[PDB]
Each structure stands twice: as C-alpha cells, then as structure tokens.
Amino acid sequence: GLSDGEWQQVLNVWGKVEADIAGHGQEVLIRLFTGHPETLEKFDKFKHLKTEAEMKASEDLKKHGTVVLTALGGILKKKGHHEAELKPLAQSHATKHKIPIKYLEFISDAIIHVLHSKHPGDFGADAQGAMTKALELFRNDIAAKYKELGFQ
C-alpha cells in the first residue's frame, strides 16, 4: 500500500530508468547474476556467460533486461492495480521458469543497488523508500500467487 506521494516518487525514479531502459536492465541483470550466481542457472540462454565481461558484451542480456524492466515499468505504472499484468508473470515465473521468491528479492535489491550506482546522490532517501515499497508490493503480490500455486 503506497500513498499517492509514494507512487509519485516511484514514477519519478522510473523516469530515470526509462531514459536508458536497456542500460538499467543490463546492469540489473548483471548485478543479479554476479551477486547471486545461482540465478544465472535459471537462464538456459545466459548460463554460458562465465565472466562479467561476457555478460556486459551480451546483446541478448541487454535485450532481456529491456524485456524485464519494460514489464516491471508497466506494472509500476498501474500504481498497485496490476493484477492483470502481474498474474502471467507470477504464473510463468512459478510454473515455467521455477523462480523462487528469494530471487525476486535479489532482483529487487539489485534494482536499488543499480539506481544508486547509476544515479549516485540522485536517488534520495524518500525515493529509495518509495521504490522499495513498490518492489515489496510487487514481490508480495507475486508471493500470494506463488502460495496459491504451492510453489516454493
């Protein structure tokens, strides 16, 4: 449950991401994969990436980063009214990709890390609070769908 002012902060922060969705998406995934190498194993199409240099050079990783952040941005712009947008992602990530909710926590924190890394001094405490709450809401609603599906 975010206030109007918190959603305003979220969407203000998101404008930073939308200016360079592929660069943000790439860095989010690289942060996820390098911080939590087990997550790489969930991607048949990225498990060949042995080094961060290879990850950085991967155009397909940037492409997927764009897909991920485009989806997330579409969800965030719903300001919590995202059941229709979230449902297929929860279902695909539980049933097809088999992504534990822990990895969604990892990527949520990776987003925060990337925002500070790319916008140092420009991702204020209020913005971090609002973005964190929005990612918690996202993760929590996914978690509810995971529970429905019995997925761990």
The footprint of ligand HEM (CB under 6 A) covers 39, 42-45, 67-68, 71-72, 89, 92-93, 97, 99, 103-104, 107
The least CB distance from residue 111 to ligand HEM, in Å, is 7
What distance, in Å, lies between the first and last C-alpha atoms of the chain? 25
Q: Which residue is nearest to ligand HEM (CB)?
A: 92
Beta-carbon contacts of 88 under 8 Å, excluding residues fewer than 6 positions away, are: none
Measured from the CB atom, is 4 or 44 closer to ligand HEM? Answer: 44
Measured from the CB atom, is 5 or 117 closer to ligand HEM? Answer: 117
CA 152 – CA 134 distance, rounded (Å):
22
CB 30 within 8 A of CB 55: yes
User: Residues comprising the binding site for O2?
Assistant: 64
